[PDB]
Amino acid sequence: KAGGGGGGGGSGVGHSTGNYNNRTEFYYHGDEVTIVCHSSRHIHLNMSESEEYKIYDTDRGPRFPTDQTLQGRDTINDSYHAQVETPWFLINPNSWGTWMNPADFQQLTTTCREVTLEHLDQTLDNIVIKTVSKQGSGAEETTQYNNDLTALLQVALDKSNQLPWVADNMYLDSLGYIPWRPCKLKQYSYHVNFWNTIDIISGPQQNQWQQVKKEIRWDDLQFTPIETTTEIDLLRTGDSWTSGPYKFNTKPTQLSYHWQSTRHTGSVHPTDPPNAIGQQGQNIRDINGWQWGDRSDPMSAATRVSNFHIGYSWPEWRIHYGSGGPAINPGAPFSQAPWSTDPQVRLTQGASEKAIFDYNHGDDDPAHRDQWWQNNLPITGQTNWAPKNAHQANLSSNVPSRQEFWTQDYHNTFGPFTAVDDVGIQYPWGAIWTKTPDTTHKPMMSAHAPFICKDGPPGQLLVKLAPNYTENLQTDGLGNNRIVTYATFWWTGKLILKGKLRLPRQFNLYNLPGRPRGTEAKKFLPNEIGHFELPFMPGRCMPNYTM
Amino acid sequence: KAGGGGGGGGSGVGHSTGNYNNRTEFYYHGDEVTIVCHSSRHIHLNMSESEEYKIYDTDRGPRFPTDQTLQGRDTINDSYHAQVETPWFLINPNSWGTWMNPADFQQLTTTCREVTLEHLDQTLDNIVIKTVSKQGSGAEETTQYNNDLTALLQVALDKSNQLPWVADNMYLDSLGYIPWRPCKLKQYSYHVNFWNTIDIISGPQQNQWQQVKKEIRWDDLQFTPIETTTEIDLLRTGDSWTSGPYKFNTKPTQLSYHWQSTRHTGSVHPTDPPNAIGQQGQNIRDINGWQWGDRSDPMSAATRVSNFHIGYSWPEWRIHYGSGGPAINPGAPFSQAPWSTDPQVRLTQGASEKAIFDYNHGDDDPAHRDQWWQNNLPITGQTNWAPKNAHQANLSSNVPSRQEFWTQDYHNTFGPFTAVDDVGIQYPWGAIWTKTPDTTHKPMMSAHAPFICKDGPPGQLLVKLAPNYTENLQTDGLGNNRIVTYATFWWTGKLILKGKLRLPRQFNLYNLPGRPRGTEAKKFLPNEIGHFELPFMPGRCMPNYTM
Amino acid sequence: KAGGGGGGGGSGVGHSTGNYNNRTEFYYHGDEVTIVCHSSRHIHLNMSESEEYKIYDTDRGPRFPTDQTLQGRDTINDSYHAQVETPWFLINPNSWGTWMNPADFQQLTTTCREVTLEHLDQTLDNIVIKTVSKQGSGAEETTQYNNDLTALLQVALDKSNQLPWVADNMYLDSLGYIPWRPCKLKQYSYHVNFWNTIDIISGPQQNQWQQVKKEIRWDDLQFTPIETTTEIDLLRTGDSWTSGPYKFNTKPTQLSYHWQSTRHTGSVHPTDPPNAIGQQGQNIRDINGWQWGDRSDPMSAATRVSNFHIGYSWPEWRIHYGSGGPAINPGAPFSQAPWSTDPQVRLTQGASEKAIFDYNHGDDDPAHRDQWWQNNLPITGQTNWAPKNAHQANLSSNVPSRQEFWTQDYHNTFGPFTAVDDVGIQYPWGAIWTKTPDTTHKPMMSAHAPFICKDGPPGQLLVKLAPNYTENLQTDGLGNNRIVTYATFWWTGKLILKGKLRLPRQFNLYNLPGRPRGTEAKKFLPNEIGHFELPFMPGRCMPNYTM
């Protein structure tokens, strides 16, 4: 939209075109809260490695099998793909923690039972473009950094969402979480049409993996540049840019976790109360009610009829093996905590996720990457491990035979009576919103991002540094035609949220097994070098009743 | 809301605070009907066994295995749970037959093709509280029943639905179906957080069952009393109470059953008509149309393409084994009548249900409980027995090989093209409405209750009898501190329905295999002692076309 | 004021004169919150043991010395006093936890940085008076409990505060903390003028204790009854009573604890930063600034001048030994945590306090009393142990001699430059408000109760049960003249608070060493008998900056 920026007017060289606001404000009126998140980053930008659009495919990636030693079980290591590489760089606000710090997100999840996205707004200002000049040889080598005052920054935004939306925050290409650190960008690219099909049932014994088709699909290939698609704003030093307001159309995410399964949910089995300490209740044998099958005499609560069912079984860790190669079809998130005996054995089957991140995304070390693995421990109550289930021919007063009873079947149990939950907010490293795929059936829930954009997602902000060519422009030349140039500028954004107030639903005091536990707090705080970690908090934090 | 009651004003001792209306009215205007159901019960109430809230767990219940004799197949007998027991008693209107009698529900299903819930309203009036006084020893023992005129009845309603909704009518804790009989209440309780996880694939051969975690989860436990949650109305004899109007937001239930499968549904296979008696039509061999696979020559109606598919396969009688223990994941209701050969063999696999009930719920005997088992016989046309299905590699003009054809696979076949039905109304013993679980994905249908409340369910009416303490109040005392007290009062309620008129869609006369068959009618009518049975009628009664 | 009550009108026998509201509401608008606490109790009342006002003195109490074995150090065990005993009973709302439950007080201290008292209001309704009648002898003994409908309850309130205010909640005579349990009252009494003076420096070696004067002072004695002082309302069953609104004039209590001493407070000593991990900063030797004495060269931060001083020294555990006997002169509250090495050694010297309480005040056991001992661990930063301090003759560049340096002096260090804090809210067992003593110098702070009433305290609600005399009234008779009678009625009160919103002042996440720690949570929740504990929370909970 071009625009203004920050608080400054900024006309020409020597005037600032905007200010710095990283503050977050909470506004409580009645049942509702308004969270206004301001986020401001200082962005470093280099030249595009190439001024050309490039279409190429890749290798398989590390650990992919070169033989049948593991019989194709490690073909899940396939990173093969094909892409266009666009000279443009992407500014991605979409993560939690680009916006709120650990104390703000704690404020959010304690005071709000749910939250929704309202508005987004963005500016770019205080553009500084410099060229580097090297004068010397070995020792006399001296780099001079000169302001190029007439050099241009190129800015493109998609309000129309005509470019392939890829800014999902997977791979964590997003603005850093630490307000006082600089952000380098990464260069925009998207997938083209390719076939990658791996046959893992190949061979005589059907134990061998084989490549079927791996190629780029050139006759169907869609190449859309930035230049022929969106308006590109050209900006000098005294110039600033605003996106204009964006309005989210989304659905609220609930900030509590549900502990109830169908055995926790409805009317309780008639019970004789204990009259003494250490005594237990006794289930009444003769009762009336609804059982499932022809079953009558064992009035046990397991076979009580229910209206709905909480959770569903899945072929957990499903590998798809489609066109484009194997992917994972997630399954429902839940907690393996009810089944966990050995702390050394790590049960991943609750559709758990793993965050790999770095210094600017909340790792306390450079040169290395910290990990997390959120296994969703509070989300018990959907927990369904497919091998733990069973089915039997009939439900009656009679126990089935060995041949009428089946176990370890790995069936999809999602159906019309099932009630499930999504993951919710993973605070530091999780994405905020997502684009909806344009298909006849649009997905019901999201496996990661808590907010699904009903119309468009917020437009992708693409910046490029216009090339500074030398006196001699040769068609054969690439980066020898162009002067070495880099920019620094300032991104500011404002994201507004609307929460619903959380008030106590219980008599007893709310407990917490999360981060506020101390003695671990030497990290999460800067050290003598200024290095620190950002803690994980779930969006689903306090317990709540399902029904 | 406190309130009035019945038709009487009732100021003080000696004035009646309400009247008795158990009449049901039908109002026919045009295409629509209005059913106004009045229901009035005389309610007996005793002291709370304890004035304390209690949290405890239970035993497993009867028939649960103590060993591996049945290898864990009888772990489906688990009733283990954990609950709070609240001193309050629950008044539950939610059942059919608390409202309509057998002649009213016959009037409903014959004249209406569908019905929806409109309003609910409730009153409590004519409060009588008495204390018992025993004077004598063995023979001289004499019980005197004295009016305590200043004693209080406590009434709490949830309009906000802040208490755990458990009044689903499972276990048939509901107001009785016979207008002239008294109703004892049962004491309100709900589930707390507990883990019950049974590993049935345990052991070396994976044939043994093992307890993994069985406990109460105290750190997540939510304890919500009635006193800190809702307003409690205190009522003496000359006092009455009204709930205020409740408005249902629901979806109509269809009062007909569907006999069409996908073989009954669309265009008919081109056929040569018979010209004589005892002759049959002949399917035309050379026809044009859409088949499924590469199939061409066998133009058979089985492989005709369709737009949708009626019914879905399920791992029938799925045992979940989640946190909280095993439960059943229902599957779609349908009729095993097309597959039933032996009347002695009872095929339960259509998601059939079993009602166990007693004297006030429509059993003609006290001291024993009658049973029903509704196997949904008219609901043929969804009938899908998973072992009866198959799948094959290709569909072509060629019959597949033995290795290309699979049977007895127990797969969930629910998908985007499927059309299914819920059970509908089971008249005497079935619930009317249900609460929706609060989850990211809310269930599409209900496995039992025909009406799903979109906003809240009707609030739970909880009554308690305020304790009458003796002169000496000791903290160590429980029921020795309190005078033996009981109450009788009168519940009145009005439930309004809106039906759509059913008019004849066919030339031939509608037949009926249901209850109007006589010679069984000596029951269903009182006998010389006044004992009688209430008949079962389905909400889905007359046949109708699906498409 | 006489009045109405609850929600009911209640005219005559058979109408309820009020309802039950124990709910607490939070109202968030902008920077401010409004907490409306409703509290409703069911109160048991017996006859006054005597219808007479009695003036008497007592014994010394247990553990008081009968000899010089401990040389008078155990004369701190003196409970001797003199009182009038008034036939009236006291209803005391003044405690936290009569009002809020553990989840409400957690809501308060997390969302509010400070809170103040606004209004108080009280009602009494649903009066039930009964007489007991015993008929039989040994086995035939039978107690009949009859409603006496014309019997009276007597109610007196002081809006004028003309009676000796003694309802300070010390001794924990206050309405119970559990909404669903009954409350017995205790009979009102206050001190008269007496001399108790114990000389502990008596004897030749000044090691012996001696009684100087122990007596009642009859010539100065002030006897004020309830009857000649306040209006007494007489109430039957169909009657109710309201106090009218009371408005608090008080000062807000701050809900955070301060960790800063004078070494934590102002400008920081000039320091050379560490450039590596594991390295420490280095204090700069040559700096400029203000030191205290003639001191110049050691520019150390200990001798930096400050404007104020946080905390003061005290002759900790001062025993007063005045008229009326020994008492303790408290000293400032603070935390011994910085000095605590042995967990087995309990350092009491921070003006710590000890709560002894029972079943209705948050003990999980009857027949025994639980304890707490709040030692104020977060309140480090005032911590001043008098023997740990010192003083020296001069402050210079020279270290003083052995004779110029003093230790262990036990001096009061309170003065014009000192800044201190009070304790704040001890949630379950602490008092809310207090009366100010009427003296030329009124106290600055309070050693226990967080709120000091500037004008009057809320009036004392005194109830008595009017005596039911038998046919024969003899002047010699006491309790043989009167029929055995008891009452039960319902107290309702509404207390309103105005908090100031707490918003995050820090980047890092707030940690907590308090109660939300689980694994201790099996208590604090009811058990199979319904017994549970109430947790302690401080009013000063989160950290905050002093300056």
Residue-wise DSSP of C484-538: -EEEEEEEEEEEEEEEEE----SSSPP---SS---SSTTTTS--TT----PPP-B
Asked if A122 and A146 count as a contact pair (C-beta separation under 8 A), the reply is no
Subunits touching A (CB < 8 Å, at least 3 pairs)?
A: B, C
Distance from CA of A516 to the nearest CA of B (A): 15
User: Are B227 and C42 a contacting pair at CB < 8 A?
Assistant: no
Choose from B187, B242, B469 for mutation: most chain C CBs within 10 A: B469
User: Are C18 and B234 a contacting pair at CB < 8 A?
Assistant: yes
Subunits touching C (CB < 8 Å, at least 3 pairs)?
A: A, B
Q: Which residue in chain C has the smallest CA separation from A22?
A: C507
Helix (H, G, I), strand (E, B) or coil at C542: strand
How many contacts, defined by CB atoms under 8 Å, are there between A and C?
Answer: 115
Number of Cβ atoms within 10 Å of the Cβ of A33: 21
Q: Which two tokens stand for residue B272?
A: 């040569």
Number of Cβ atoms within 10 Å of the Cβ of A277: 9
Q: Which residue in chain B has the smallest CA separation from A254?
A: B440
Nearest CB partner across the interface for B57, out of A281, A405, A545:
A281
Q: What is B54-68 written as a DSSP string?
A: EEEEB---TT--SSS
User: Are A303 and B190 a contacting pair at CB < 8 A?
Assistant: no
How many contacts, defined by CB atoms under 8 Å, are there between A and B?
Answer: 383
Nearest CB partner across the interface for A28, out of C29, C273, C509:
C29
Nearest CB partner across the interface for A506, out of C103, C501, C503:
C103
The structure tokens 């002042």 sit at C505
Helix (H, G, I), strand (E, B) or coil at B486: strand
Give φ, ψ of C473 to 5 degrees.
Answer: -105, 110
User: Which chain A residues contact residue C103 at CB under 8 A?
Assistant: 504, 506-510
Instruction: Tell me the CA distances in angstroms from C386 to C127, C292, C394, C404, C409, one per residue in order.
Output: 56, 21, 20, 18, 7
Asked if A10 and A240 count as a contact pair (C-beta separation under 8 A), the reply is yes
Asked if A173 and A92 count as a contact pair (C-beta separation under 8 A), the reply is yes
**Backbone interruptions in chain B following residues (C to N > 2.5 Å):** none
- Solving technique for this entry? cryo-EM
Distance from CA of B254 to the nearest CA of C (A): 43
β-pairing, A82-91 vs A182-184, is unpaired
Ramachandran bin of A496, using left for φ above 0, alpha for ψ from -120 to 50, beta for the remaining angles: beta
Task: Give residue C486's identity as a one-letter amino acid code.
Answer: Y
Choose from A255, A260, A290 for mutation: most chain B CBs within 10 A: A290
C-alpha C247, offset from chain centre = 20
C-alpha A356, offset from chain centre = 12
β-pairing, A241-242 vs A282-283, is unpaired
Asked if A60 and A200 count as a contact pair (C-beta separation under 8 A), the reply is no
Angle of CA points C182, C186, C191, to nearest 5°:
155
Q: How many helices (H) and strands (E) does chain A have?
A: 1, 32
Asked if B242 and B121 count as a contact pair (C-beta separation under 8 A), the reply is yes
The structure tokens 């309509």 sit at B100
Q: What is B101-121 written as a DSSP string?
A: -HHHHHHHHHHEEEEEEEEEE
Distance from CA of C464 to the nearest CA of B (A): 15
Instruction: Tell me the CA distances in angstroms from A198 to A61, A79, A215, A220, A319, one per residue in order.
Output: 15, 12, 12, 21, 12
d(CA C101, CA C23): 10
Choose from B224, B228, B229, B484 for mutation: most chain C CBs within 10 A: B228
Asked if C378 and C259 count as a contact pair (C-beta separation under 8 A), the reply is yes
Number of Cβ atoms within 10 Å of the Cβ of A367: 7
Give φ, ψ of A301 to 5 degrees.
Answer: -65, -20
CA-wise closest residue to C332 among C382, C259, C375 = C382
Q: Which residue in chain A has the smallest CA separation from B194?
A: A264
Task: Give residue B290's identity as a one-letter amino acid code.
Answer: W
Taking the CA atoms of chain A, what radius of gyration do you get in angstroms?
A: 28
CA-wise closest residue to B72 among B204, B210, B197, B212 = B210
User: Are B317 and A283 a contacting pair at CB < 8 A?
Assistant: no
User: Which chain C residues contact residue A282 at CB under 8 A?
Assistant: none
User: Are C27 and A30 a contacting pair at CB < 8 A?
Assistant: yes
Asked if B155 and B462 count as a contact pair (C-beta separation under 8 A), the reply is yes
Instruction: Tell me the CA distances in angstroms from C442 to A163, B179, C105, C338, C446, one per residue in order.
Output: 75, 72, 30, 33, 11
* Sheet of A289-291, strands arranged across: A289-291, B354-357, B370-371
Task: Give residue B55's identity as a one-letter amino acid code.
Answer: I
User: Are C46 and B230 a contacting pair at CB < 8 A?
Assistant: no
Helix (H, G, I), strand (E, B) or coil at A256: strand
> What is the length of chain C?
547
Q: Which residue in chain B has the smallest CA separation from C128?
A: B150
Nearest CB partner across the interface for A302, out of B62, B326, B330:
B326
Distance from CA of C460 to the nearest CA of A (A): 29
C-alpha C134, offset from chain centre = 42
User: Which chain C residues contact residue A28 at CB under 8 A?
Assistant: 28-30, 33, 501
d(CA A291, CA A301): 9
Give φ, ψ of A102 to 5 degrees.
Answer: -60, -30
Q: Which two tokens stand for residue A208?
A: 């061998």
d(CA A392, CA B260): 28
User: Are A528 and C103 a contacting pair at CB < 8 A?
Assistant: no
d(CA C486, CA C48): 10
User: Which chain C residues contact residue B229 at CB under 8 A?
Assistant: 23
Q: What residues pair up with C183 in beta bridges, in sequence order?
A: C43
Number of Cβ atoms within 10 Å of the Cβ of B204: 6
Asked if A165 and A457 count as a contact pair (C-beta separation under 8 A), the reply is yes
Helix (H, G, I), strand (E, B) or coil at A289: strand
Q: Which residue in chain A has the smallest CA separation from B217?
A: A259
User: Are C525 and B137 a contacting pair at CB < 8 A?
Assistant: no
- Which stretches does DSSP call E strand in C95-248? 112-135, 142-147, 153-157, 182-184, 186-191, 194-202, 208-216, 232-235, 241-242, 246-247
User: Are C23 and B149 a contacting pair at CB < 8 A?
Assistant: no
Distance from CA of B321 to the nearest CA of C (A): 26
CA-wise closest residue to C68 among C214, C206, C215, C213 = C206
CA-wise closest residue to B97 among B430, B344, B503 = B430
User: Are B236 and C16 a contacting pair at CB < 8 A?
Assistant: yes
Angle of CA points A517, A519, A524, to nearest 5°:
80
d(CA A38, CA C474): 84
Number of Cβ atoms within 10 Å of the Cβ of B168: 26
How many contacts, defined by CB atoms under 8 Å, are there between B and C?
Answer: 153
User: Which chain A residues contact residue C509 at CB under 8 A?
Assistant: 102-103, 106, 515-516, 524, 535, 537
User: Are C526 and B12 a contacting pair at CB < 8 A?
Assistant: no
β-pairing, B390-392 vs B405-407, is antiparallel
The structure tokens 């022929």 sit at A228
User: Are B227 and C179 a contacting pair at CB < 8 A?
Assistant: yes
Angle of CA points B314, B320, B322, to nearest 5°:
155
CA-wise closest residue to B541 among B516, B506, B518 = B516
Q: Is the dihedral of CA B467, B473, B477, B481 positive or negative?
A: negative
User: Which chain A residues contact residue C271 at CB under 8 A?
Assistant: none
Number of Cβ atoms within 10 Å of the Cβ of C533: 18
Q: Count Cα atoms within 13 angstroms, Cβ side, for A453.
A: 23
d(CA B118, CA B37): 11
Angle of CA points B344, B345, B350, to nearest 5°:
130
Nearest CB partner across the interface for A110, out of C110, C274, C281:
C110
Task: Give residue B309's identity as a one-letter amino acid code.
Answer: H
Give φ, ψ of C76 to 5 degrees.
Answer: -70, -5
User: Are C182 and B84 a contacting pair at CB < 8 A?
Assistant: no
Distance from CA of C463 to the nearest CA of B (A): 17
B359 Cβ neighbours under 8 A, 6+ residues apart: B365, B366, B531
Give φ, ψ of A396 to 5 degrees.
Answer: -150, -170
Q: Count Cα atoms within 13 angstroms, Cβ side, for A16.
A: 7
Resolution of the PDB structure in angstroms:
2.7
Q: Is the dihedral of CA C110, C116, C119, C124 positive or negative?
A: positive
